[PDB]
Amino acid sequence: VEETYIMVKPDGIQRGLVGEIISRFEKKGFKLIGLKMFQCPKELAEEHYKDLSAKSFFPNLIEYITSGPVVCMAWEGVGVVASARKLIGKTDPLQAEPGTIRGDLAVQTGRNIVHGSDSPENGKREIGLWFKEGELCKWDSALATWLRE
Amino acid sequence: VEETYIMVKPDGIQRGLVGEIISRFEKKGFKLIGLKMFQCPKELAEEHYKDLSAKSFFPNLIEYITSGPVVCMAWEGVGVVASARKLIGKTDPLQAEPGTIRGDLAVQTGRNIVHGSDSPENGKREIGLWFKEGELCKWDSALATWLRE
Amino acid sequence: VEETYIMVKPDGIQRGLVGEIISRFEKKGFKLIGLKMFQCPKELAEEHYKDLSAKSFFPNLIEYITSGPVVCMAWEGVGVVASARKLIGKTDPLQAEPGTIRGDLAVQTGRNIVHGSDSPENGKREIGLWFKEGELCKWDSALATWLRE
Amino acid sequence: SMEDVEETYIMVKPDGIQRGLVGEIISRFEKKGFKLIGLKMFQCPKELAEEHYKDLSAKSFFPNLIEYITSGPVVCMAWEGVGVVASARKLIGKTDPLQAEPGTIRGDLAVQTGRNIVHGSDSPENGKREIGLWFKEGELCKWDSALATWLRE
Amino acid sequence: SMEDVEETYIMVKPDGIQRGLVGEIISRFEKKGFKLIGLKMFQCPKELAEEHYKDLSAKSFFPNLIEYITSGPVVCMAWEGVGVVASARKLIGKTDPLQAEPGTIRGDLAVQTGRNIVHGSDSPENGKREIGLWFKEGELCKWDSALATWLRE
Amino acid sequence: SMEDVEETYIMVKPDGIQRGLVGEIISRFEKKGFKLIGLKMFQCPKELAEEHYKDLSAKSFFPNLIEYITSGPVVCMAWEGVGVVASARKLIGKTDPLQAEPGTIRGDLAVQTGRNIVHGSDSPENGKREIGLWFKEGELCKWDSALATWLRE
């Protein structure tokens, strides 16, 4: 079953939005299989944003993502990748639509409180990078039959 | 005044979303004139979904709507039919936008928690099939003057 | 299994608290087995307040519950009667504690938005008085094993 | 960052007060991340209402429009932030609540154009204009938000 | 019935504004069923804060309290209702948030006495005194609630 | 007198995950104003469960406690704050959800002792013991809260 990586950025923790963001995906109906408050070491952050090493904002990006603890999450479900992206909203919170996480709870791209894998491949890549295999938990949801036929 | 039929499907009851769904329409400003937890008979389910009788998924649909009690609702208000449809969201919860009932609380078409009449006449037709004579309660809202000029 | 009668009074409907009240019991973990919006006839009201027919406030009590539609409910669960009473709060909303329904959402005894049976005996009695044959719905809750050992 | 911070006027109309939506509407903007710098419950005089709805004085709904906005107290607000004018308009939704999208204030909480509970300046210029019209000298409160560094670079 | 509608002063302290709880606190009283008749974000002048806490002027913590209550804007409020003074006190909870019971504002949202988010008049006499001190005569807005007949008999 | 910052272990039992209450529980403590310094979805190894419930090892139901806590994933948390241990117990409510008061986690969300959703350390000593037991040595995350000065003097 498809999985995706969702991460509450440092500003989300500082603003006390961890529970609220988790609740949005819980209420949606997806299965949480990985969760941890984590202090991202610089090298791991730089590997995540590897493709942007040549960009002028790279230094700022790394400083930001390591400026405080983040909350790493892995969610499972059919279509979870695209759905999570939709629930999170556009990159720029000002443009993100009301109803989405960034559209309801953020005002600037550089402090857009949360991240979601943009594709199933990046979903697997990110979960493998941020989590240590033994950290994911498998379980049978009692409401499974009522969330999907 | 225009009326529409809104129903919380079996999965909504099992997931304890009855109150939450009702509140969405109450807060919106529409008038609740009919409400009841009901055990849908195969016969009624087949008459309701007659526009899908020839479909291959028709059988699974009938047994699903009868897989548990449902919550029948009749709401009143100018433009309530189209408005409820909008608040409910696209048939496929994965595609329904965040902010709508399905977009916020469901993940699969076969378990999309709620139904809303698609047109005024169908609203009239559905209320007639699901509710009995004096089962509907007509009343005048104290806030009427503040919701409609 | 123990059952209790809970009713949103006319003022609860007028103030749009139907969904909110239902959610409180849904979230608590009890099972909704009966629900309906209903316009209470004078005679049935007087029946409900049988033992208070000699009271000075009897006539006021009767007009109040018949001044608008009410939402009748039947909830099932171990200790649901006493628990429902605790969730509802003191008779006088001013005295009811914050966190309870009346303590959070009402301001006067004469408009205390909701009612709950005061004993298992009155629970059976009240459900038998307000609900007719076949109106109650029994079902097996998917989360039953997670609400009770 | 050198982004330009602007201000917008947001007002809870009489119907918003009657329906007890003041706190809920304020929370939407507070939770969004913008800064509240002006707030007051206010009874709008006919004069101010007409000066505010000047570009509609010729309309047929103007008479009722004025009586509507002065039919009870409103809650005046001034919010600060980068892109707050356009953002507020997005959070509020289409003029007609029936068409406003779920998630927006009017999309979630109103049912008719004439009773669409809230207003937000349509442009940075009208933002300055409206704030200057509804708020008196010294009513606005400037302050430094503790979370400023967490809402904007 | 014929009951006495009193008024009480409720103020969201500087910490409530910094934590973005203005809307949330207002909603608790709106949802309870009381009537908001006065509201304004306000930067409390030092003298006014000293008059408000006049009875504590000799205390060792007084200088620090005045400095604190003037360290950021507050939100002044006037609420009306039968028994609103005692009810507001109950809804707010004990002075020490750690001891305040879950369900109350302080019990749910604060952790320390010095930063307990909101204040409510402790008596009707103080409600009158406080409203008279923080609000200018013409700032209060009286109105008739459409739901009046549904909140009280 | 002034007390030191304290730490407590709060755990969402298997029933909390199954019911999708993880976010809701976290929010109660976040909203309260305490600092989250440890969090993880975890599959409890039997040896750890035994140490956790060591004080009840002589109880006839000890086996049941171990089996249940190891039957499905749990969510481990470490929270910091002055008086956080007693406060968390208060927010959680009485062991029997039927007796727990409305406003508390168990009072609002549970109906049976065996399925009472969450656990909070019963003493500061046990808070430190449990945090060291459930979290690996490098799993805690320390940080300076931007709102610190607004939550406590």
Side-chain angles (χ1 to χ4, degrees):
Chain A
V1 183
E2 182 172 297
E3 313 177 333
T4 192
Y5 178 65
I6 304 183
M7 172 176 66
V8 182
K9 303 180 174 180
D11 47 322
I13 281 59
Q14 283 282 0
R15 287 216 276 149
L17 303 176
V18 181
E20 173 165 32
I21 293 176
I22 290 176
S23 289
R24 292 213 177 190
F25 297 110
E26 274 187 302
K27 293 171 186 170
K28 178 62 170 172
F30 291 117
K31 177 159 63 176
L32 178 65
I33 56 174
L35 179 68
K36 70 178 177 179
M37 172 168 270
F38 179 67
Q39 175 58 223
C40 188
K42 280 181 177 296
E43 272 185 47
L44 183 50
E46 302 178 338
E47 170 161 44
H48 175 66
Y49 294 121
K50 172 175 59 184
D51 300 354
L52 312 174
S53 183
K55 304 302 183 181
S56 67
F57 59 77
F58 190 68
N60 286 185
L61 177 56
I62 305 305
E63 200 75 77
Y64 162 53
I65 210 64
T66 61
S67 70
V70 297
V71 171
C72 307
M73 304 182 276
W75 292 82
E76 183 190 88
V78 41
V80 69
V81 174
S83 184
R85 292 286 291 190
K86 182 177 284 296
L87 296 198
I88 286 169
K90 299 182 179 182
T91 305
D92 183 348
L94 293 177
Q95 292 306 307
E97 297 302 327
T100 63
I101 293 173
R102 299 198 279 222
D104 291 332
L105 311 170
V107 301
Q108 192 194 62
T109 305
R111 293 287 187 279
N112 64 357
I113 59 179
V114 66
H115 159 78
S117 296
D118 73 344
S119 66
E121 66 168 57
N122 282 166
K124 287 190 176 182
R125 170 182 177 293
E126 302 179 350
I127 289 180
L129 183 68
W130 293 81
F131 283 99
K132 305 184 64 181
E133 180 46 69
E135 300 185 314
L136 285 59
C137 300
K138 305 310 298 175
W139 56 291
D140 304 295
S141 182
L143 293 167
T145 304
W146 297 105
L147 272 301
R148 309 214 212 72
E149 70 183 312
Chain B
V1 182
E2 182 168 297
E3 292 172 20
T4 191
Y5 176 67
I6 305 178
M7 173 174 68
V8 181
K9 302 176 182 183
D11 52 318
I13 283 64
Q14 283 286 355
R15 279 213 281 151
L17 308 178
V18 180
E20 169 156 39
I21 292 175
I22 291 175
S23 289
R24 293 218 175 190
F25 295 110
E26 270 182 308
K27 294 178 186 173
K28 176 64 171 173
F30 289 121
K31 185 195 298 176
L32 179 60
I33 58 176
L35 178 71
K36 64 175 187 180
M37 178 171 254
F38 179 67
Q39 203 60 277
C40 184
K42 172 187 175 182
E43 286 59 52
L44 176 59
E46 303 188 307
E47 269 298 301
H48 180 68
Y49 294 116
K50 181 139 60 180
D51 292 296
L52 305 171
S53 58
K55 304 304 177 184
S56 58
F57 57 72
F58 184 65
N60 304 296
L61 204 182
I62 300 299
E63 271 52 60
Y64 158 59
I65 300 300
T66 307
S67 67
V70 296
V71 168
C72 311
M73 302 185 281
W75 293 80
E76 183 194 276
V78 55
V80 69
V81 176
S83 185
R85 294 286 292 193
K86 180 182 289 292
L87 290 179
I88 286 173
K90 294 186 179 179
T91 299
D92 184 351
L94 294 175
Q95 292 305 309
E97 299 301 333
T100 63
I101 297 170
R102 290 173 179 160
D104 289 332
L105 312 166
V107 300
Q108 189 205 61
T109 299
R111 305 287 171 181
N112 55 15
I113 321 164
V114 64
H115 160 82
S117 305
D118 63 37
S119 70
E121 286 303 331
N122 272 318
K124 294 172 63 291
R125 171 172 175 284
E126 280 164 30
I127 289 179
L129 269 50
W130 296 84
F131 287 93
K132 297 171 179 293
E133 295 302 68
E135 209 158 56
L136 297 179
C137 302
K138 312 305 289 297
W139 53 290
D140 299 292
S141 176
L143 292 167
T145 305
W146 297 104
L147 277 130
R148 190 184 307 167
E149 64 185 307
Chain C
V1 180
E2 185 169 296
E3 312 183 324
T4 191
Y5 179 66
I6 304 181
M7 169 177 65
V8 179
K9 302 179 180 184
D11 52 319
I13 282 65
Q14 283 279 4
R15 295 176 57 205
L17 305 173
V18 178
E20 204 176 330
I21 289 173
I22 290 172
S23 287
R24 293 224 180 182
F25 292 106
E26 273 189 301
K27 296 185 181 183
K28 176 65 172 174
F30 291 119
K31 181 164 64 182
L32 173 61
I33 58 176
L35 175 73
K36 69 175 184 175
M37 175 170 253
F38 179 64
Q39 177 62 208
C40 186
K42 301 297 183 180
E43 192 178 67
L44 180 53
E46 303 170 60
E47 229 303 303
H48 177 70
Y49 293 120
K50 194 174 183 292
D51 54 297
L52 304 177
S53 59
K55 302 297 183 179
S56 173
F57 51 72
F58 184 66
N60 304 298
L61 196 59
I62 300 301
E63 290 187 65
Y64 166 45
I65 68 178
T66 58
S67 65
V70 298
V71 171
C72 311
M73 302 179 278
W75 292 80
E76 183 193 275
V78 178
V80 67
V81 174
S83 183
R85 295 283 284 189
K86 187 178 286 290
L87 287 189
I88 290 174
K90 300 279 192 62
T91 63
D92 183 349
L94 296 180
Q95 293 305 311
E97 302 295 343
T100 66
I101 294 176
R102 292 168 177 164
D104 289 336
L105 309 163
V107 302
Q108 198 196 64
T109 304
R111 295 290 190 275
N112 60 1
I113 61 185
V114 64
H115 162 78
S117 299
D118 73 348
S119 63
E121 293 64 51
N122 280 316
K124 291 184 175 182
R125 186 223 165 197
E126 280 164 29
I127 288 176
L129 184 64
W130 297 81
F131 286 92
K132 305 192 301 72
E133 281 293 303
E135 297 196 313
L136 299 182
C137 305
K138 192 51 67 294
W139 51 292
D140 301 307
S141 184
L143 291 165
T145 60
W146 298 108
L147 272 298
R148 304 185 53 63
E149 301 187 70
Chain D
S1 171
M2 296 180 274
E3 298 176 352
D4 87 310
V5 186
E6 53 190 37
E7 312 180 336
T8 190
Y9 175 66
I10 299 184
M11 176 180 65
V12 181
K13 302 180 181 182
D15 46 317
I17 281 61
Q18 284 281 355
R19 286 212 282 147
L21 302 174
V22 181
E24 177 162 37
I25 290 176
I26 288 174
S27 289
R28 295 223 175 186
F29 296 107
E30 264 184 311
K31 292 184 297 184
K32 176 65 174 172
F34 291 122
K35 184 194 297 178
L36 181 61
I37 61 171
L39 177 72
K40 67 174 179 178
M41 173 168 262
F42 179 72
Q43 179 62 215
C44 186
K46 299 183 178 182
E47 179 191 300
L48 185 56
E50 294 190 58
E51 177 58 50
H52 177 66
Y53 288 119
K54 53 158 55 181
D55 297 0
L56 300 175
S57 62
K59 302 300 180 178
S60 60
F61 55 71
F62 185 68
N64 295 305
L65 181 59
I66 298 300
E67 295 185 297
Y68 158 54
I69 201 177
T70 67
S71 65
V74 297
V75 168
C76 307
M77 301 182 273
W79 291 82
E80 172 192 291
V82 177
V84 68
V85 179
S87 181
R89 292 193 67 69
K90 180 183 289 294
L91 273 61
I92 290 173
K94 290 183 177 178
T95 304
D96 182 345
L98 297 178
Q99 301 297 151
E101 296 300 327
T104 64
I105 293 174
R106 302 201 279 227
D108 291 333
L109 310 166
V111 300
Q112 192 200 65
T113 303
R115 291 290 143 63
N116 64 359
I117 59 182
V118 64
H119 158 76
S121 305
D122 58 36
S123 70
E125 53 193 302
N126 280 309
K128 294 179 180 176
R129 168 178 158 290
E130 300 176 353
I131 290 176
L133 183 63
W134 296 83
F135 289 97
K136 297 183 179 184
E137 289 303 308
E139 296 193 316
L140 296 181
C141 300
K142 305 300 178 173
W143 54 287
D144 299 313
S145 181
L147 293 164
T149 194
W150 296 104
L151 271 300
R152 291 206 302 276
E153 294 180 55
Chain E
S1 62
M2 297 170 274
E3 307 197 307
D4 83 309
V5 189
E6 52 184 26
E7 311 185 342
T8 189
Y9 178 65
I10 303 182
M11 174 174 63
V12 182
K13 299 176 188 182
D15 50 321
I17 280 57
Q18 286 281 356
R19 294 176 59 197
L21 308 171
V22 178
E24 177 163 15
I25 293 175
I26 289 172
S27 288
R28 291 211 179 194
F29 294 111
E30 278 184 301
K31 289 180 184 178
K32 174 64 172 175
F34 290 123
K35 183 191 299 179
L36 175 65
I37 59 173
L39 176 71
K40 71 179 176 179
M41 172 174 263
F42 184 71
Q43 176 60 223
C44 188
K46 189 176 183 177
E47 327 75 82
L48 188 58
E50 299 183 315
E51 244 309 294
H52 175 61
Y53 291 119
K54 186 166 56 179
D55 291 347
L56 312 173
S57 68
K59 299 291 177 292
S60 70
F61 60 71
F62 188 71
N64 206 55
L65 168 61
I66 298 302
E67 174 72 13
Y68 161 67
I69 203 65
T70 61
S71 65
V74 296
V75 167
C76 307
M77 304 183 280
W79 291 82
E80 196 174 64
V82 179
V84 72
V85 177
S87 182
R89 276 254 145 177
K90 179 179 282 292
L91 280 181
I92 289 168
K94 296 188 187 304
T95 300
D96 182 352
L98 298 174
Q99 293 306 313
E101 215 63 35
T104 63
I105 293 168
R106 290 170 177 164
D108 290 334
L109 309 167
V111 299
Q112 197 257 316
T113 300
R115 297 287 182 278
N116 59 11
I117 315 170
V118 62
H119 155 80
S121 301
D122 73 356
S123 72
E125 13 281 293
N126 277 321
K128 295 178 182 182
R129 172 184 171 294
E130 285 166 22
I131 286 175
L133 182 67
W134 292 85
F135 285 97
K136 285 65 179 61
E137 219 308 302
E139 297 189 313
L140 299 177
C141 302
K142 305 304 293 68
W143 52 288
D144 290 304
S145 173
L147 287 166
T149 301
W150 296 104
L151 272 84
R152 295 207 296 278
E153 187 185 2
Chain F
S1 59
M2 37 271 107
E3 195 173 65
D4 304 301
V5 165
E6 187 162 273
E7 316 105 330
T8 191
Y9 177 63
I10 301 178
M11 170 172 62
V12 179
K13 300 175 180 182
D15 47 309
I17 284 62
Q18 284 286 353
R19 276 214 278 157
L21 306 175
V22 176
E24 206 177 324
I25 297 173
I26 292 178
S27 293
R28 294 218 174 192
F29 294 108
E30 271 185 307
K31 293 296 193 178
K32 178 68 175 172
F34 287 122
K35 182 161 61 186
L36 178 59
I37 60 173
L39 179 70
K40 70 176 175 178
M41 175 170 257
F42 185 65
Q43 205 69 266
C44 191
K46 192 169 177 297
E47 49 264 48
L48 204 166
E50 285 163 39
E51 264 303 286
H52 175 68
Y53 290 119
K54 73 176 182 182
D55 292 350
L56 303 169
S57 65
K59 297 294 182 174
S60 64
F61 52 78
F62 180 65
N64 303 276
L65 293 172
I66 301 302
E67 172 274 310
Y68 184 62
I69 223 302
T70 294
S71 67
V74 298
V75 171
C76 309
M77 307 185 270
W79 294 84
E80 220 171 51
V82 175
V84 70
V85 174
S87 182
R89 298 284 289 186
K90 193 173 201 64
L91 287 180
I92 288 171
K94 293 185 176 180
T95 301
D96 184 347
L98 292 176
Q99 292 305 311
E101 298 302 329
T104 63
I105 294 174
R106 302 204 280 232
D108 294 331
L109 312 168
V111 303
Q112 203 257 149
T113 303
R115 292 298 103 89
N116 62 3
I117 313 297
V118 63
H119 157 82
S121 303
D122 68 13
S123 73
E125 290 177 57
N126 277 157
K128 301 171 187 176
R129 200 257 292 186
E130 280 159 27
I131 286 175
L133 180 65
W134 293 83
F135 288 93
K136 297 183 179 177
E137 60 175 286
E139 299 189 315
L140 290 182
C141 303
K142 302 302 185 180
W143 53 288
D144 294 308
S145 185
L147 287 169
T149 66
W150 298 104
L151 265 190
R152 58 188 268 77
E153 307 184 67

